[PDB]
Amino acid sequence: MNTVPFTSAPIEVTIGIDQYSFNVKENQPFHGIKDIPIGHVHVIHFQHADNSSMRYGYWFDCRMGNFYIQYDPKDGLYKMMEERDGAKFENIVHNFKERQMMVSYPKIDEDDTWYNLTEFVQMDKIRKIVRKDENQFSYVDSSMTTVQENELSDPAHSLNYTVINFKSREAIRPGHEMEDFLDKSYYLNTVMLQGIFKNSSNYFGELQFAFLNAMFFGNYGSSLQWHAMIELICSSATVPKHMLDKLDEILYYQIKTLPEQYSDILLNERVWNICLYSSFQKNSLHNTEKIMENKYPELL
Amino acid sequence: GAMNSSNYAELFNNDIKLFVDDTNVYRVTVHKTFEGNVATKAINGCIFTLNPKTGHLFLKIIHTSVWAGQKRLSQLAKWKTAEEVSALVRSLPKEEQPKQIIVTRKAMLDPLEVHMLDFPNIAIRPTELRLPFSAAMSIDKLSDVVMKATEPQMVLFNIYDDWLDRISSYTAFSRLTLLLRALKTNEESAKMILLSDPTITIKSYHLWPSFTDEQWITIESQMRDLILTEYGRKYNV
Ligand SMILES: CN(C)C1(CN)Cc2ccccc2C1
């Protein structure tokens, strides 16, 4: 189990760690988060008490370094940093644990939610979507736009998700116009899976990462990407059986975890009704359809 | 964006454009089988592609052979239409290719857009107008060449005959759409109107009778009368 210490908490902020969150008061003696499970990526995120605009946060993996949080009063946000002196870090953390100034990552033992939400997500792929190579961790916020969004303006602060576009030459083979637009199997299996992602695990990783950025930061371009990647699978007549089974599980846990009060903005009526009821895979997503129907029957 | 009453003069400016109407591409008769079930038999069709400024009609005849062994024919029809339009554009010299293609039914938008991906600078647009181009098969010479075709065939007509020698394209399009609206609302009466006087003929190279300016005004008035009536006859007013 690893630890992310905080130098201090000078401004009142709601802090998130994965799907958990807690309120910290202005200058409350708060010095970090302990007992963070090894083996998964994590995200630590922030919403200031004063400006609910700009949720923001950091993707990281404690196996890749010793990371901490320090408020910057000039830029006015909590910043993740890496500590390169391992002895200094161990010493800081042990003192803060002895004084019990740290919250405990509060995982229930029965609970596999975070694993299920992040199964295929890997830090190395996050870092290629979020390009900032001098840090081992990745910053995301509500406002960041995607590469595809920019093509329809600062390239350094973009989310470089894989561009998916159903009405493009990449997706449509000359002379297969109708075939390829109504059955996207070519685009899914040959173009994207074999050509671009290489395997379905990297595809699912980007899909899961896009969902989490949409949920945690209300990042609209990420929500668009999550829905596009779902629709590409569901609108393909030919999908490996193992991919459909896993997709059903992935989506199930995403729908289970989504705040009931955000379904209006984070869920696209058209995509979901099409995927569950009209598409080739309308009968291949049993778990997802059952939770969608019992939790958000209004959407459908 | 969409074409409507408000940007109607754009049709007659100097940017090349085409209307595409697919309503007569897939055409069927519905009949009973010996077993008392219902079946369709397809008949020849056509794509109606029209330059509203010049009157140039590119009538692509759709032979029934193109449906043989195919499923979901009403969906294919839209894609077949888009394939044929895209082939037409590619066959034209660059300086004759349209800058916009206006489809008369919104369901053609995605088919045409996908088939025209090679032409990013050609705008594909819908319209809010309820244009009467389906009544093109009420024009006897157009109907006759469609029904006689024994293979796929493109036939090139000027739907305005020689009208542009005396009137503007705006006025010619208004005349055309009035004639077609009439033929669509009451084919028999409309056709009675156009031929009642045996002394007015259709030149071999024309689609419509050789009316004088004054005779066209009478004709147009009669077509309006017909259209207003049928509208009463229909709603009782
Ligand atoms: C018979 N007329 C001379 C046309 C065909 N020769 C001129 C033209 C050009 C393009 C499309 C239709 C038409 C009609």
Query: For position A258, which CATH number holds?
Result: 1.25.40.550
Q: State the CB neighbour count (10 A cutoff) for residue A245.
A: 14
Rg (CA), chain A: 20
Output the CA torsion sign for B17, B79, B142, B66.
positive
Rounded distance between C-alpha atoms, residue A132 and residue A151, angstroms: 21
Q: What are phi and psi of A279, to 5 degrees?
A: -80, 175
Measuring from atom 5 of ligand 1, which residue has the nearest CA?
B156
Closest by Cα among B18, B229, B228, B46 to B134: B46
- A107 CB-near residues (< 8 Å, 6+ apart): A35, A37, A114
Beta bridge partners of A2: A36
Per-residue burial over B14-37, b if 16 or more Cβ lie within 10 Å, else e, is eebbbbbbbbbbbbeeeeeeeeee
Q: Which amino acid is at B157?
A: F
For residue A181, which residues of chain B lie inside 8 Å, CB to CB?
Answer: 110, 114
> Two tokens at B139?
């024009």
Let me know: does A133 contact A165? Beta carbons within 8 Å: no
Burial classification of residue B138, based on how many CB atoms lie within 10 Å of its CB (0-12 exposed, 13-18 middle, 19 or more buried): middle
Q: If phi over 0 gives left and psi between -120 and 50 gives alpha, with beta otherwise, what is residue B101?
A: beta
Q: SS3 of B19, please?
A: strand
Which amino acid belongs to residue A299?
L
Q: Show the tokens assigned to B232.
A: 């009463």
Q: Which residues from chain B sit within 8 angstroms of residue A168, using beta carbons?
A: 117
Work out the burial of residue B1: count CB atoms within 10 Å of its CB; fewer than 13 is exposed, 13-18 middle, 19 or more buried: exposed
What are the two backbone dihedrals, phi and then psi, of residue A173, each rounded to the nearest 5 degrees? Answer: -75, 130
- Pairing outcome for strands B123-125 and B100-103: parallel
Contact of A160 with A233, CB cutoff 8 Å: no
Q: List, in order, residues 6 or more apart from B85 with CB less than 8 Å away.
A: B18, B20, B47, B49, B101, B112, B115, B116
- Distance, in Å, from the CA atom of B195 to the CA atom of B139, rounded to the nearest integer, reads 12
The secondary structure element, H or E, covering residue B229 is helix B213-235
Cα radius of gyration (chain B): 19
d(CA B146, CA B137): 9
Topology of the domain covering B9-163: Nucleotidyltransferase; domain 5 (3.30.420)
In order of B197, B215, B216, the CA distances from B193 in angstroms are: 9, 11, 11
The Cα A271–Cα B74 span in angstroms is: 24
Amino acid at B233: R
Tokens of A167: 């009405």
Q: In chain B, how long is the greatest CA-to-CA distance?
A: 58
Instruction: Give the alpha-carbon dihedral of A242, A248, A253, A257, to 10 degrees.
Output: 150
Write the DSSP string, A269-283.
Answer: HHHHHIIIIISTTTT
**Domain carrying residue A243:** 116-299
Using CA atoms, how far residue A282 sits from A274, A277, A287, B127, B220, in Å, is 8, 5, 12, 33, 54
Q: HSE-up of A227 (CA within 13 Å, CB side)?
A: 19
Q: How close is the nearest chain A Cα to the Cα of B118, in Å?
A: 8
How far apart, in whole angstroms, are the C-alpha atoms of residue A28 and residue A124?
A: 35
Task: State the angle between helix axes of A241-257 and A286-295 in degrees (0 to 180), rounded to the nearest 10.
Answer: 20
Give B157 Cα–ligand 1 centroid separation in angstroms: 5
Give φ, ψ of A69 to 5 degrees: -115, 135
Q: In 10 A of CB A73, how many CB atoms? A: 8
Sequence spans of domains, chain B: 9-163, 164-237
- Please tell me the distance in Å from A169's CA to the nearest CA on chain B: 7
Distance in angstroms (rounded) separating the CA atoms of residues B146 and A162: 48
- Compute the Cα dihedral for B143, B148, B153, B155 and give only its sign: negative
Q: How far away is chain A from the Cα of B235, in angstroms, using its nearest Cα?
A: 38
Residues 6+ apart with CB under 8 A from B27: B42, B43, B44, B45
Residue B159 alpha carbon to ligand 1 centre in Å: 10
Note the resolution in Å, 1 decimal.
1.6
Measure B156 CA to ligand 1 centroid, in angstroms: 5
The angle at the Cα of B180, spanning B177 to B184, to the nearest 5 degrees, equals: 135
Distances (CA, A) of A120 to A71, A116, A205, A271: 31, 9, 4, 23
CB distance B67 to B55 below 8 Å: no
Look up tokens 């302990």; give the residue: A34
Report DSSP state, residue A37.
Answer: P
Rounded distance between C-alpha atoms, residue B231 and residue B237, angstroms: 8
Residue ranges with strand state E in chain B: 17-21, 27-32, 38-43, 45-50, 56-62, 100-103, 123-125, 153-158
- Give SS3 for B195: helix
* CA B95 / ligand 1 centre spacing (Å): 16
Would residue A217 be called left, alpha or beta, if left means φ above 0 and alpha means ψ between -120 and 50 degrees?
alpha
What ligand 1 atom has the least distance to the C-alpha of B51?
A: 11
Mutate to test the interface with B, among A168, A176, A178 (most CBs of B within 10 A): A178
Pairwise CA distance, residues A148 & A236, whole Å: 22
User: Residue B18 pairs with which residues in a beta bridge?
Assistant: B101
Query: Which letter does DSSP use for residue A191 in this model?
Result: I
Q: Is B160 touching ligand 1 by the criterion CB < 6 Å?
A: no
Q: Is B58 in the pocket of ligand 1 (CB under 6 A)?
A: yes
Distance of alpha carbon A144 from alpha carbon A222, whole angstroms: 9
Q: Where are the alpha helices (DSSP H) in chain A?
A: 86-98, 113-118, 123-129, 147-150, 177-182, 185-186, 200-217, 220-234, 241-257, 263-266, 269-273, 286-295
What 3-state DSSP class applies to B21? Answer: strand
At residue B39, the 3 state secondary structure works out as strand
Q: What are phi and psi of A243, to 5 degrees?
A: -75, -40
Could you tell me the CA-to-CA distances from A256 to A17, A260, B163 in Å, in that order? 18, 9, 68
Distance CA B211, CA B230 (A): 25
* Residue A123 burial (C-beta neighbours within 10 Å; 0-12, 13-18, 19+): middle
In A, minimum Cα distance to B109 occurs at A167
The structure was resolved experimentally with X-ray
The tokens describing B156, both together, are 């090139």
DSSP string, B79-136: HHHHHHHHHHHHHS-GGGS-SEEEESSGGGHHHHHHHTTT-TTSEEE-B-S---GGGG
d(CA A137, CA A63): 11
Rounded distance, CA A125 to CA A209, Å?
A: 10
User: At a CB cut-off of 8 Å and minimum separation 6, what does B35 contact?
Assistant: none
Phi/psi at A209 (5° precision): -70, -40
The residue among A248, A242, A246 whose CA lies nearest residue A287 is: A248
Contacts by A167-173, CB closer than 8 A, 24 or more apart:
A167/B110, A167/B113, A167/B114, A167/B117, A168/B117, A169/B117, A169/B118, A172/B114, A172/B117
* One-letter identity of residue B142: L
The tokens for A261 are: 């009060």
The atom number, within ligand 1, closest to the CA of B157 reads 14
Rounded to a whole number of angstroms, the distance between the first and last alpha carbons of chain B is: 36
Burial of A86 (0-12, 13-18, 19+ CB in 10 A): exposed
B117 with A181: Cβ contact below 8 A: no
User: Please, which residues bridge with residue A122 across strands?
Assistant: none
d(CA A83, CA A85) in angstroms, rounded, equals 6
User: How many CA atoms are closer than 13 Å to the CA of A280, on its beta-carbon side?
Assistant: 18
**Pairing state of beta strands A42-48 and B27-32?**
unpaired
Both tokens assigned to A11: 């401004």
Strands A2-5 and A32-36, sheet pairing? antiparallel
Which residues in chain A touch residue B82, judged by CB atoms under 8 angstroms apart?
A: 177
Cα–Cα distance for residue pair A90/A287, rounded to 1 Å: 44
Q: For chain A, what is the largest distance between any 2 Cα atoms, rounded to a whole number of angstroms? A: 70
| Nearest Cα to Cα of residue A142 among A221, A48, A229 | A221
CATH 1.20.80.40: does it fit domain B164-237? yes
Rounded to whole angstroms, the Cα distance separating B76 from A190 reads 25
